[PDB]
PDB file of C-alpha atoms in Angstrom:
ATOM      1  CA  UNK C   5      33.458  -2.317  -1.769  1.00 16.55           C
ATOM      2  CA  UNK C   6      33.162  -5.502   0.050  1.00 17.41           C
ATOM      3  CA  UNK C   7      29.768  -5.534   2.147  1.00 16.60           C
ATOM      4  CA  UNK C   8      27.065  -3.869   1.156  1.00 16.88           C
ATOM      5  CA  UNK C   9      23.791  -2.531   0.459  1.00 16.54           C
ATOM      6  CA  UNK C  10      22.055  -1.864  -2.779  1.00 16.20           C
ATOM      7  CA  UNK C  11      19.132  -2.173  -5.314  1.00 18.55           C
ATOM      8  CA  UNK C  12      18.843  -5.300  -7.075  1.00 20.39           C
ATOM      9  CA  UNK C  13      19.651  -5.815 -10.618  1.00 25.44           C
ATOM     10  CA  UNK C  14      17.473  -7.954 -13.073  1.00 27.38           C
ATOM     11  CA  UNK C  15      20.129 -10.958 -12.869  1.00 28.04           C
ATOM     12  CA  UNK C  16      18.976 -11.167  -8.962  1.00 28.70           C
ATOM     13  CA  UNK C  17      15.544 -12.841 -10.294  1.00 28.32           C
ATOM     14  CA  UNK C  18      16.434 -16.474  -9.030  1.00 28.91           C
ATOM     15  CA  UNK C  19      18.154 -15.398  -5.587  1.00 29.59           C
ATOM     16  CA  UNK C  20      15.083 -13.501  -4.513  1.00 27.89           C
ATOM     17  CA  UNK C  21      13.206 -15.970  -5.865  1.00 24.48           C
ATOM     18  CA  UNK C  22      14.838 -18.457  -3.865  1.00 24.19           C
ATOM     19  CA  UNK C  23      14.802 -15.995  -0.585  1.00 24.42           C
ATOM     20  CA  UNK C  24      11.479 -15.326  -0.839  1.00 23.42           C
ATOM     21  CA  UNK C  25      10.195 -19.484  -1.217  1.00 25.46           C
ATOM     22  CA  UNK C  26      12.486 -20.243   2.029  1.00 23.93           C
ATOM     23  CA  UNK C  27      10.839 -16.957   3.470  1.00 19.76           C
ATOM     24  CA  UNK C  28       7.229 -17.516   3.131  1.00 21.14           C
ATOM     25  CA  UNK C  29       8.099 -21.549   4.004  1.00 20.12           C
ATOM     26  CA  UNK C  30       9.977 -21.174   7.356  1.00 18.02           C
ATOM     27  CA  UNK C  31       7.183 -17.965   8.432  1.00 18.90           C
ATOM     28  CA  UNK C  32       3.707 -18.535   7.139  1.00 18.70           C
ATOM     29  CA  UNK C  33       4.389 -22.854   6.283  1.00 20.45           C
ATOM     30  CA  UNK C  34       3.866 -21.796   2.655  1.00 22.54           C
ATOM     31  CA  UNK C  35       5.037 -23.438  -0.279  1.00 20.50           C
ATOM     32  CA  UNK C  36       4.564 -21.048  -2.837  1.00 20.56           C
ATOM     33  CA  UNK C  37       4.242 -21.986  -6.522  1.00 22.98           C
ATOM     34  CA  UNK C  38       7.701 -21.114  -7.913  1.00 21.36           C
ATOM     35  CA  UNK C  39       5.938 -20.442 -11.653  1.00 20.40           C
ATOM     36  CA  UNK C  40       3.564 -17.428  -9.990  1.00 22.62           C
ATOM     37  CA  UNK C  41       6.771 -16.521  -8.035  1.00 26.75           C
ATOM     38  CA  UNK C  42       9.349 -16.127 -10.028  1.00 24.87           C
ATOM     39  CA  UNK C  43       6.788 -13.701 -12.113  1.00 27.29           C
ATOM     40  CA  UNK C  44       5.668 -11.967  -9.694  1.00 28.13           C
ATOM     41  CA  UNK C  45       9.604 -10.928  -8.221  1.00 28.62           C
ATOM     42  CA  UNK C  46      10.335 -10.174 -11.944  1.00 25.81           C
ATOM     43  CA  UNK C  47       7.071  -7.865 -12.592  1.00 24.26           C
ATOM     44  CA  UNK C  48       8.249  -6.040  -9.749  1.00 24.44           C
ATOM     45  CA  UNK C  49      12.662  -6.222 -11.008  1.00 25.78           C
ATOM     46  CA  UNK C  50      10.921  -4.750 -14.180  1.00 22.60           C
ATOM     47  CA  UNK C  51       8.892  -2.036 -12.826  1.00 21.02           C
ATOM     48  CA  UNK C  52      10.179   0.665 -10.300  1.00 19.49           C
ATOM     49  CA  UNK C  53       7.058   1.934 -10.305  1.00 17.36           C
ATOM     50  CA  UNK C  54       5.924  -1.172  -8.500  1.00 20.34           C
ATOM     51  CA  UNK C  55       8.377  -1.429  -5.215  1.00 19.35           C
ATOM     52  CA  UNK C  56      11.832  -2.057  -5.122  1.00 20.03           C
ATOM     53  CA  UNK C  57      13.797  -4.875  -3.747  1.00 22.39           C
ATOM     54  CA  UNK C  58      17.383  -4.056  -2.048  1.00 22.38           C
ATOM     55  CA  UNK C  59      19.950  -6.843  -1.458  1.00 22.40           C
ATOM     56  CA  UNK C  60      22.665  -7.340   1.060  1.00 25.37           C
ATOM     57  CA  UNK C  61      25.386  -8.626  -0.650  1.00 22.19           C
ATOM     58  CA  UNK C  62      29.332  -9.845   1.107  1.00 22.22           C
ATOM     59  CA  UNK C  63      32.286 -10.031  -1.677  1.00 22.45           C
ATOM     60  CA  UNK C  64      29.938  -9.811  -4.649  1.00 21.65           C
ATOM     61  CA  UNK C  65      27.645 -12.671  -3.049  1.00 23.66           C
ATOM     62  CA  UNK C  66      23.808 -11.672  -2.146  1.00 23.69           C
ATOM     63  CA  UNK C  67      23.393 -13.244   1.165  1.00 25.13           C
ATOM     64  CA  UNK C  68      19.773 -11.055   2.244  1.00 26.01           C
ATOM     65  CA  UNK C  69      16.902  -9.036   0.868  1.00 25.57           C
ATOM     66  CA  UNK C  70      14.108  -6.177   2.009  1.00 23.77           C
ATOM     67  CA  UNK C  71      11.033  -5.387  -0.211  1.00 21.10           C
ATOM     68  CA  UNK C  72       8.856  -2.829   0.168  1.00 21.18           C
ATOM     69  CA  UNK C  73       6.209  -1.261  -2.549  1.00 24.12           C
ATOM     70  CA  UNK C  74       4.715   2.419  -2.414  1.00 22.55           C
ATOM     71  CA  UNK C  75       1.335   4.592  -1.324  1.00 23.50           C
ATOM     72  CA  UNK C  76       1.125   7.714  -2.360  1.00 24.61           C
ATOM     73  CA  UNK C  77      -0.645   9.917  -0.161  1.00 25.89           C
ATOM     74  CA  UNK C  78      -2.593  13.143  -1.891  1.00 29.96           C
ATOM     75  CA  UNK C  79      -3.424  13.879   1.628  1.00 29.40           C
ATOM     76  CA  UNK C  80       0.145  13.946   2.464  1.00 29.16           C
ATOM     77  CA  UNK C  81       1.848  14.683  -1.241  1.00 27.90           C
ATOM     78  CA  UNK C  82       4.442  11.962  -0.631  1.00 28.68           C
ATOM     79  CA  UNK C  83       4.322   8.605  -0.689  1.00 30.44           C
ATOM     80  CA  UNK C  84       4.458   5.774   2.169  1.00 32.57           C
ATOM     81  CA  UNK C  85       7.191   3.185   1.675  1.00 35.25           C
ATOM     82  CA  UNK C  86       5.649  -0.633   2.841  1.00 32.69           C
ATOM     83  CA  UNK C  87       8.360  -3.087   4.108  1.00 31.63           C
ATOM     84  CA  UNK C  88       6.363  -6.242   2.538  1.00 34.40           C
ATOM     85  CA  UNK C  89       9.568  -8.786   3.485  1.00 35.91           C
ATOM     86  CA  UNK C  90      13.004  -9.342   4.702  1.00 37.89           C
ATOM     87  CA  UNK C  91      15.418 -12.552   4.445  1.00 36.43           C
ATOM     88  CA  UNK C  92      18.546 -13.529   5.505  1.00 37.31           C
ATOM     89  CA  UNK C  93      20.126 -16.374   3.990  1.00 37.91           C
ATOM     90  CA  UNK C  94      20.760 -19.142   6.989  1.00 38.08           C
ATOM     91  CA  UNK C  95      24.289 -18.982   7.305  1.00 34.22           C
ATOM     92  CA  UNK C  96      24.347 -15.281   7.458  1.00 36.50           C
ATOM     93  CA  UNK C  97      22.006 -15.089  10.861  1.00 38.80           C
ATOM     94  CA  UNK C  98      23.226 -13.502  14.024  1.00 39.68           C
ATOM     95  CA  UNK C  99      25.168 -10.783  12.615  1.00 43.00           C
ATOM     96  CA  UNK C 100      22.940  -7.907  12.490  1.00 42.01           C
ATOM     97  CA  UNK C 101      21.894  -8.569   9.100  1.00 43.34           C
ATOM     98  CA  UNK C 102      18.149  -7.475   9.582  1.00 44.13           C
ATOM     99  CA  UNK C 103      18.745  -4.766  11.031  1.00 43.09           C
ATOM    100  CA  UNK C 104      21.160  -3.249   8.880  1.00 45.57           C
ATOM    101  CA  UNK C 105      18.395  -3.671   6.549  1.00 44.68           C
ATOM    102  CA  UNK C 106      15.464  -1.766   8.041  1.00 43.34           C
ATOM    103  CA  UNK C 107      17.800   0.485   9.522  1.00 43.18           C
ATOM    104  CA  UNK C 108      18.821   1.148   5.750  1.00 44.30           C
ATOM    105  CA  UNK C 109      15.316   1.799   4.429  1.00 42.77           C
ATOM    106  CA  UNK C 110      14.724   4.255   7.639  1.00 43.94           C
ATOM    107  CA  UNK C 111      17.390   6.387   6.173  1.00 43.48           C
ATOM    108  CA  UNK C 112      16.059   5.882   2.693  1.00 44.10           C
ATOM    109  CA  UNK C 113      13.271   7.481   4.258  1.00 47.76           C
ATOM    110  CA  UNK C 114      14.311  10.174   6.550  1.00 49.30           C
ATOM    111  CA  UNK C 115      16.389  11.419   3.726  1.00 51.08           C
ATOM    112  CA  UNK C 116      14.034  11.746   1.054  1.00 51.40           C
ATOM    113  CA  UNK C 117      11.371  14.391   1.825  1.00 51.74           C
ATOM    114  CA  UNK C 118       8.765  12.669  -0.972  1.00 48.82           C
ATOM    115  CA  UNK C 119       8.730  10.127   1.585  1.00 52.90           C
ATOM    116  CA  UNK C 120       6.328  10.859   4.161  1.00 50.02           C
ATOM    117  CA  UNK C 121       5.965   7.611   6.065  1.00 52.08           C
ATOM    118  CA  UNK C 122       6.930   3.832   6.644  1.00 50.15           C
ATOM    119  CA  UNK C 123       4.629   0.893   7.513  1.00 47.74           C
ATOM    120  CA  UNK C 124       4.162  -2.641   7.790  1.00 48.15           C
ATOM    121  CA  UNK C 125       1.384  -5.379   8.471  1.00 49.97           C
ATOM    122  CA  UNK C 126       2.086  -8.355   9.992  1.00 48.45           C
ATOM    123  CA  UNK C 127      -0.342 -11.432  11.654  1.00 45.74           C
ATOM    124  CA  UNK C 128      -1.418 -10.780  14.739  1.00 46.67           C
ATOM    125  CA  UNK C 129      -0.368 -14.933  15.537  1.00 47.01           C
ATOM    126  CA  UNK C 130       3.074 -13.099  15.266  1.00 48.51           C
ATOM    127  CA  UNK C 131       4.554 -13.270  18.854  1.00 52.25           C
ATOM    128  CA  UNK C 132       7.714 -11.867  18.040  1.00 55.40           C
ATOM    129  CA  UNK C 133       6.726  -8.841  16.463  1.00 57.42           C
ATOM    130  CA  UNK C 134       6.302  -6.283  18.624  1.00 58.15           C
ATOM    131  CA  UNK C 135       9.745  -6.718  20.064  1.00 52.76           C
ATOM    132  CA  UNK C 136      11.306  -7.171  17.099  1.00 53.79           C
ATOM    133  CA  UNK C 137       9.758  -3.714  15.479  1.00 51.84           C
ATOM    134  CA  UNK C 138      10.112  -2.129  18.502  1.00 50.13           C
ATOM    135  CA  UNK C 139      14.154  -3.040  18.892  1.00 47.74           C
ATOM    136  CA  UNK C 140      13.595  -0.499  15.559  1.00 48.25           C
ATOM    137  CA  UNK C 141      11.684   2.278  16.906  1.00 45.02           C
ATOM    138  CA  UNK C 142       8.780   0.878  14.775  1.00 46.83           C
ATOM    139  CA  UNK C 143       5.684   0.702  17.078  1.00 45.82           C
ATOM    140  CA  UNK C 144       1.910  -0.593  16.503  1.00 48.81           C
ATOM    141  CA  UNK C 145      -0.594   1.732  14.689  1.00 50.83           C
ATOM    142  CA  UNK C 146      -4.053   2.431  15.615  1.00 55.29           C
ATOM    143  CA  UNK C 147      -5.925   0.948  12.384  1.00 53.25           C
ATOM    144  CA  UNK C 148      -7.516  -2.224  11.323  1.00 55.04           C
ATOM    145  CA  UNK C 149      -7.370  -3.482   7.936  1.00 55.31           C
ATOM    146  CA  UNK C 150     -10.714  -4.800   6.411  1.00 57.31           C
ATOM    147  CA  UNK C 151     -10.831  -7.120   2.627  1.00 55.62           C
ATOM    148  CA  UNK C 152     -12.747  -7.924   0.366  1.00 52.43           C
ATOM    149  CA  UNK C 153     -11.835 -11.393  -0.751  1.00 48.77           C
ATOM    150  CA  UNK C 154     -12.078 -11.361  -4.745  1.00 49.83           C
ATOM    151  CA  UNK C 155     -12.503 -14.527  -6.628  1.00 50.73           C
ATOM    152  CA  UNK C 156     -12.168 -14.972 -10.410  1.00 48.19           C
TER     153      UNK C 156
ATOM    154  CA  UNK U   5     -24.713   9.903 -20.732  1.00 43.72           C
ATOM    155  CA  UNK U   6     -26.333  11.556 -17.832  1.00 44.88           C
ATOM    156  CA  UNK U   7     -25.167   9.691 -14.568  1.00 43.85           C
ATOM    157  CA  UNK U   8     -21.887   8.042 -15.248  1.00 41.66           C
ATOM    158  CA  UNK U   9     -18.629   7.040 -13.305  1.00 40.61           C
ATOM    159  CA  UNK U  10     -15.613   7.724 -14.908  1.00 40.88           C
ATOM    160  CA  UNK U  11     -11.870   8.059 -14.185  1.00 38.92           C
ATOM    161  CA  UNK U  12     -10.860  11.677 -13.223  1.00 38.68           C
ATOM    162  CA  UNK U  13      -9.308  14.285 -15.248  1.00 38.14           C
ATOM    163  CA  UNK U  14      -7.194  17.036 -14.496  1.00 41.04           C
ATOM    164  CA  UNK U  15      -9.750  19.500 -14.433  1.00 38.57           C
ATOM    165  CA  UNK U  16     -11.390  17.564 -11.668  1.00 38.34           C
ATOM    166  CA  UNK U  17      -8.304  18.761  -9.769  1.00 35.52           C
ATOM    167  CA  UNK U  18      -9.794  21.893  -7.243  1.00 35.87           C
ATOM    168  CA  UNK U  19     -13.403  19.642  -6.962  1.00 37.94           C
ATOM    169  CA  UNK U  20     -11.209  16.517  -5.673  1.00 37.95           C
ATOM    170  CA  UNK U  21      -8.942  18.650  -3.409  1.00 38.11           C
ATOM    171  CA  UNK U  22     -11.882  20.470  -1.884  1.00 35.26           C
ATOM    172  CA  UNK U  23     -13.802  16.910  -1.329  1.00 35.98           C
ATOM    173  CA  UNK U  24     -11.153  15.463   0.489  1.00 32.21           C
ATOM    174  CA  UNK U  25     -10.169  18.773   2.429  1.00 30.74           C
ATOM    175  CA  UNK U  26     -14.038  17.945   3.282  1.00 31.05           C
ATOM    176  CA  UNK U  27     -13.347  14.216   4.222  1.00 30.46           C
ATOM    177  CA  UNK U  28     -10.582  14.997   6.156  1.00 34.04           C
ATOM    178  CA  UNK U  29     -12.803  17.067   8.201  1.00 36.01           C
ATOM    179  CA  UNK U  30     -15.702  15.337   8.856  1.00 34.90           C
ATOM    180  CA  UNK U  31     -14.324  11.265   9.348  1.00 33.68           C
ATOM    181  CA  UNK U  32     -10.593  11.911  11.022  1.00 33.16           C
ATOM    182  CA  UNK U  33     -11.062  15.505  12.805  1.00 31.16           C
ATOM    183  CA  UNK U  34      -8.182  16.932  10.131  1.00 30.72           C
ATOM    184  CA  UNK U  35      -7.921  20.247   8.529  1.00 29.49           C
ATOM    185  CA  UNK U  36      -5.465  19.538   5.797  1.00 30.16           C
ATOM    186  CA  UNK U  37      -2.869  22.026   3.971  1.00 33.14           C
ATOM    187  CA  UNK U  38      -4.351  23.138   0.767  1.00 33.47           C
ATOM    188  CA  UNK U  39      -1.152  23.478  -0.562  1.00 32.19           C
ATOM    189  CA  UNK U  40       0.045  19.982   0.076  1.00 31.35           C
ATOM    190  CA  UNK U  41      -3.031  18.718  -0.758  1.00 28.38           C
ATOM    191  CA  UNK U  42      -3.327  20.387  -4.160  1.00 31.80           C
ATOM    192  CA  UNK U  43      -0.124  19.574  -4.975  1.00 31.53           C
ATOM    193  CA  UNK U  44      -0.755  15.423  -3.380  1.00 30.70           C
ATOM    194  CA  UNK U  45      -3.962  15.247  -5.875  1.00 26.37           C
ATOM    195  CA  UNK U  46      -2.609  16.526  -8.972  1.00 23.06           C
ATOM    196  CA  UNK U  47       0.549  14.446  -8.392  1.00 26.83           C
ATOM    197  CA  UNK U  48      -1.941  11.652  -8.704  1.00 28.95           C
ATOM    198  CA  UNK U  49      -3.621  12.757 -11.806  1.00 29.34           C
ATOM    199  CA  UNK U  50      -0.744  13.088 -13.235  1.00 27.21           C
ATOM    200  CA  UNK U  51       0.629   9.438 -12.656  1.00 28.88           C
ATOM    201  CA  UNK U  52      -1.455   6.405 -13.085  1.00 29.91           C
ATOM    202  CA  UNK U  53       0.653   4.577 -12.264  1.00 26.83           C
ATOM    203  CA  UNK U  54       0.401   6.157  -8.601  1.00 22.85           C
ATOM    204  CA  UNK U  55      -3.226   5.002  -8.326  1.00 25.82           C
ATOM    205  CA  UNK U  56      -6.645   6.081  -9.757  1.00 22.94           C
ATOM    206  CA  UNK U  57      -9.283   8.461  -8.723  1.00 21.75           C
ATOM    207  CA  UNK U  58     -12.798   7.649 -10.154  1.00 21.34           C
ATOM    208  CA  UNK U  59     -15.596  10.875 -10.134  1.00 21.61           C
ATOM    209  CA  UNK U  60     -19.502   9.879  -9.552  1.00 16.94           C
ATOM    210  CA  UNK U  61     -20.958  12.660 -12.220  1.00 15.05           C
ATOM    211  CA  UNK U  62     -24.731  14.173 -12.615  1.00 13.83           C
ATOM    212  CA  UNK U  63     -25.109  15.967 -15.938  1.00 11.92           C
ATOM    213  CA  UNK U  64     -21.547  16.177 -16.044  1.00 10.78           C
ATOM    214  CA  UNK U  65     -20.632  17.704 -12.236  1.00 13.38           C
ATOM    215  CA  UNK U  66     -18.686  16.043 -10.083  1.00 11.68           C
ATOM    216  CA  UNK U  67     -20.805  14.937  -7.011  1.00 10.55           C
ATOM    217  CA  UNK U  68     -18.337  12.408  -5.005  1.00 12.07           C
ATOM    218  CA  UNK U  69     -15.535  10.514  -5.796  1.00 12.01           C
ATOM    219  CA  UNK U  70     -13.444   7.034  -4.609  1.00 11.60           C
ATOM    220  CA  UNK U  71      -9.326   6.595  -4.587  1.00 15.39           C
ATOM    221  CA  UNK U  72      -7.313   3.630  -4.454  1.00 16.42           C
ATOM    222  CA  UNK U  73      -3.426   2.720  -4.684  1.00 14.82           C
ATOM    223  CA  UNK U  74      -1.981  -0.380  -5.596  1.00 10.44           C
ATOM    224  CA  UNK U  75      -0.055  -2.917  -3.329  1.00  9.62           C
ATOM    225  CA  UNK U  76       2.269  -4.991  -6.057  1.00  8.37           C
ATOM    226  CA  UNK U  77       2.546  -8.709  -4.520  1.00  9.03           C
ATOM    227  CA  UNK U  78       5.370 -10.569  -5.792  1.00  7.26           C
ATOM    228  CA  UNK U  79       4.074 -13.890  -3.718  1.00  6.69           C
ATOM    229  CA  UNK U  80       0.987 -13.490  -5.877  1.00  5.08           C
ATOM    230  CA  UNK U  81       1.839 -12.237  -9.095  1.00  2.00           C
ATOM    231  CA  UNK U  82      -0.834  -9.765  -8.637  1.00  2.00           C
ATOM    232  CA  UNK U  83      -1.902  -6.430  -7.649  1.00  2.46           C
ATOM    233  CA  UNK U  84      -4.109  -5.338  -3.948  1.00  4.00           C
ATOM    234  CA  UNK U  85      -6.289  -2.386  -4.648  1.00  5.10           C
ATOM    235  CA  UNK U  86      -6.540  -0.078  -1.648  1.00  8.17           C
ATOM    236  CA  UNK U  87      -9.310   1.981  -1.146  1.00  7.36           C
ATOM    237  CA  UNK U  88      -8.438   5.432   0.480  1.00  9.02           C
ATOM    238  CA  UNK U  89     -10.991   7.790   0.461  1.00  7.04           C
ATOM    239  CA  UNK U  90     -14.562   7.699  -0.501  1.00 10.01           C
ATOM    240  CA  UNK U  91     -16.220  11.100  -0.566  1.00  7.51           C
ATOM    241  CA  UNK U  92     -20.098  12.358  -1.709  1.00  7.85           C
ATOM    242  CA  UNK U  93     -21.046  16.005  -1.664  1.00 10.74           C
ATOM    243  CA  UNK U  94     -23.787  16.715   1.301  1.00 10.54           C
ATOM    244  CA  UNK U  95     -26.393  17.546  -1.221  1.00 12.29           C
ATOM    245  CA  UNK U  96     -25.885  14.505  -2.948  1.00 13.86           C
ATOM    246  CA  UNK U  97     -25.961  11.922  -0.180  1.00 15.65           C
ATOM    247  CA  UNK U  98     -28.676   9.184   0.945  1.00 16.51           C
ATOM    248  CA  UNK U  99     -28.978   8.420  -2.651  1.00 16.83           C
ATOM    249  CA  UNK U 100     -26.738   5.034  -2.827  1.00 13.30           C
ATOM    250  CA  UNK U 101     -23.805   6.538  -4.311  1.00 12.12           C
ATOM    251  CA  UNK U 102     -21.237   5.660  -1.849  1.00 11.56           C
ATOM    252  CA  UNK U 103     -22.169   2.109  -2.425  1.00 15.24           C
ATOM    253  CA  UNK U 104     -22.504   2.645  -6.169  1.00 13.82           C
ATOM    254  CA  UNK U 105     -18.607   4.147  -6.201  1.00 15.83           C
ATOM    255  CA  UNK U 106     -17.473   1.046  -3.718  1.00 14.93           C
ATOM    256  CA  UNK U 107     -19.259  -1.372  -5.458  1.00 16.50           C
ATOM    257  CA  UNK U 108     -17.979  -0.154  -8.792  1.00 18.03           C
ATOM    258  CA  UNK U 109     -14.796  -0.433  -7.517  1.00 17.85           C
ATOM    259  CA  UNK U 110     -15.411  -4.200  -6.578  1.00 17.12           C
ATOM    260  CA  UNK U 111     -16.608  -5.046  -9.854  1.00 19.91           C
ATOM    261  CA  UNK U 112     -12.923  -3.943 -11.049  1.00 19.23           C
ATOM    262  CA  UNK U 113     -11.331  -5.899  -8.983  1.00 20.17           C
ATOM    263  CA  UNK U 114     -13.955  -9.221  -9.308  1.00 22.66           C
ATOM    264  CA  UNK U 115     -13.191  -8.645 -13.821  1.00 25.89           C
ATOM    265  CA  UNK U 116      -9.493  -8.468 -13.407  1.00 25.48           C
ATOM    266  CA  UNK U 117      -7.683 -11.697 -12.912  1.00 25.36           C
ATOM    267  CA  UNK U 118      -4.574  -9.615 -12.122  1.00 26.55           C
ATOM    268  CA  UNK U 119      -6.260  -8.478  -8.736  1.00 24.32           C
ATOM    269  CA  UNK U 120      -5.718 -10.369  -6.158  1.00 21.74           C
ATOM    270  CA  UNK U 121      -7.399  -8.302  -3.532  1.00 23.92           C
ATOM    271  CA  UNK U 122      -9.055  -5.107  -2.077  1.00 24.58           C
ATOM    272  CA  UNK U 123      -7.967  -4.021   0.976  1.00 25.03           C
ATOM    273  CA  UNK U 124      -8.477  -0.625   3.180  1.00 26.26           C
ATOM    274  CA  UNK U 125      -7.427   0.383   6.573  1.00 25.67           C
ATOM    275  CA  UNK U 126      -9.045   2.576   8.980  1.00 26.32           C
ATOM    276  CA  UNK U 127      -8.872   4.255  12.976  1.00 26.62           C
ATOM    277  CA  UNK U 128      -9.830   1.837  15.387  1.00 20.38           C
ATOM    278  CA  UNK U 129     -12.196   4.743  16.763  1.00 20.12           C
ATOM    279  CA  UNK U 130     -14.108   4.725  13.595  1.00 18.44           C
ATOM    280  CA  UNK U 131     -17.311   3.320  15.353  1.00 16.07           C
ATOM    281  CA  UNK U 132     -19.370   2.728  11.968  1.00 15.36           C
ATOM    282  CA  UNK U 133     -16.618   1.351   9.647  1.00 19.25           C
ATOM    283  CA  UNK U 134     -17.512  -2.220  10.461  1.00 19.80           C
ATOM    284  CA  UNK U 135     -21.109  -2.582  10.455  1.00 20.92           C
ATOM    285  CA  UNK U 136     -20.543  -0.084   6.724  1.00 16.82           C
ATOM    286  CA  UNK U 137     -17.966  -2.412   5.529  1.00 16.47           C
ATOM    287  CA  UNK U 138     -19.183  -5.502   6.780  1.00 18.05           C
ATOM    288  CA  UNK U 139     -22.154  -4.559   4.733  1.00 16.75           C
ATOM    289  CA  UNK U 140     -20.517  -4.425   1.280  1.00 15.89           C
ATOM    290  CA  UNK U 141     -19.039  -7.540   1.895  1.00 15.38           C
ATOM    291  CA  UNK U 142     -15.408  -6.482   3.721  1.00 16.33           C
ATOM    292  CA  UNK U 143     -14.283  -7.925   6.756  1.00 16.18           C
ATOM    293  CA  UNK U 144     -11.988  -7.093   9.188  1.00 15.70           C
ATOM    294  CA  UNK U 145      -8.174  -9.033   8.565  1.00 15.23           C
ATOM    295  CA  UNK U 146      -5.942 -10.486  10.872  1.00 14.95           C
ATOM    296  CA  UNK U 147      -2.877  -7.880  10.718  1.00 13.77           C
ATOM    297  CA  UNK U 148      -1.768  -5.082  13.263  1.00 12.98           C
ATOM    298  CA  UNK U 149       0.226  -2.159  11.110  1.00 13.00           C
ATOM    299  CA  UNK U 150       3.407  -0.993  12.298  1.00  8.70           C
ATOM    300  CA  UNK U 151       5.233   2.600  11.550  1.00 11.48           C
ATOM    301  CA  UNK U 152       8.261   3.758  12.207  1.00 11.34           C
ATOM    302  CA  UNK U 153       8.144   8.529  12.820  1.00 14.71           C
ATOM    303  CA  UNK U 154       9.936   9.486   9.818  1.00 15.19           C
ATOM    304  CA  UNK U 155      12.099  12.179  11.158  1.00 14.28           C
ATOM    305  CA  UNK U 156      11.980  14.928   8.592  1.00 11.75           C
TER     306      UNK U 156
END
């Protein structure tokens, strides 16, 4: 094989590390504590049960990721896949990259009958959303979120 | 004990499926499939992993119970909890116990440092959701949902 798509493997911990710092920097003008992190992609490498990342990858080398996590439904006796993040390493951009990678997890979910739905949340500030999810056939639902904001 | 909140157990399985069946009803204008739905709940029960259903009991009968899932964030190193359903038996209600099942649920999530949220989302048409959650503390977020018709 010499592009593609799959799950990552434990020795992925620093790339998607690395993707996700330069993700949350250039989109939300985060710079997230590499310590918390780097735990936090590895709780999730560790546990399937958690989410799953999957990883682009050209000639061996893992150039993007897409992460989504799980709700099971009782209402619906499947679960919900939830993209949670996508990115594309800088000098892979313009190539269809992104899309290849929702377009993945659609069939991920269109072929898997214990999969009963996909969803996303995103800022409202986010101007180019709507086009961009629509470009997908993804489209705004009609529910607000609410939180309660915890502190230890 | 005589009043007590405790995690479900299998044999709460037909009183669960029959509460939400009655949700379902009542707050979205749904009449679910029994089938799926029986099969959706015990799926849970069976897997904590999948989430947790909590029972409000009176002299050991189930009188309403509370569901959440789990949102895994990798940025956070931490877990959302995500309220689902909250259900109490007509001839039970007026007596606090929605509050005392959401506000048990808050204590949870204020004890473990490993939470890093609660979180729920709701129809827009919902005309009481606000001034109910608003009153326990939960305020509406910033984030429009997106979905993409999983074609079956």
């Amino acid at each position: 094989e010499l592009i593609e798509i799959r799950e990552a493997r434990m020795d992925d911990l620093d790339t998607i590390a690395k993707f996700n710092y330069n993700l949350a920097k250039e989109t939300e003008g985060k710079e997230l504590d590499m310590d918390v992190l780097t735990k936090g992609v590895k709780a999730l490498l560790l546990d399937e049960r958690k989410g799953k990342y999957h990883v682009y990858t050209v000639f061996d080398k893992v150039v993007a990721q897409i992460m989504y996590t799980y709700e099971w439904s009782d209402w619906r006796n499947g679960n919900f896949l939830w993209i949670q993040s996508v990115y594309v390493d800088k000098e892979y951009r313009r190539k269809g990259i992104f899309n290849y990678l929702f377009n993945y997890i659609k069939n991920i979910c269109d072929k898997d009958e214990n999969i009963v739905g996909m969803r996303l949340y995103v800022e409202k500030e986010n101007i180019n959303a709507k086009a961009t999810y629509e470009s997908l056939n993804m489209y705004e639902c009609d529910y607000n979120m609410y939180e309660y904001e915890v502190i230890h």
